[PDB]
């Protein structure tokens, strides 16, 4: 049981780290938003164009990571 729950803890740590690290590395830009650094750290979105850009900022990445942190803790 300790083995299984430790793997659950590892999953939580890795997923929270994935969301946070991905949001920090893609903060300056990505393929969807090549000029994300020109909009600041926190902005709503880039509109519904180019397929839709909801929760594209790094602030939104931290935002989604708080749920995973709460789940891990």
């Amino acid at each position: 049981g300790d083995f299984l729950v430790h793997h659950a803890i590892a999953l939580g740590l890795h997923t929270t780290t994935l969301i946070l690290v991905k949001g920090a590395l893609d903060a300056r830009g990505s393929k969807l938003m090549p000029d994300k650094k020109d909009f600041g750290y926190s902005f709503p979105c880039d509109g519904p164009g180019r397929g839709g850009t909801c929760d594209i900022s790094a602030y939104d990445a931290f935002y989604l990571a708080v749920f995973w942190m709460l789940n891990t803790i």
Binding site: D35, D38, F39, G47, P48, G49
Partner: peptide, 17 residues
Amino acid sequence: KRCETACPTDFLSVRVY
């Protein structure tokens, strides 16, 4: 940002901040 949706250049030629 309808203008950005209507722009066909890659990347966009019009930007709204």
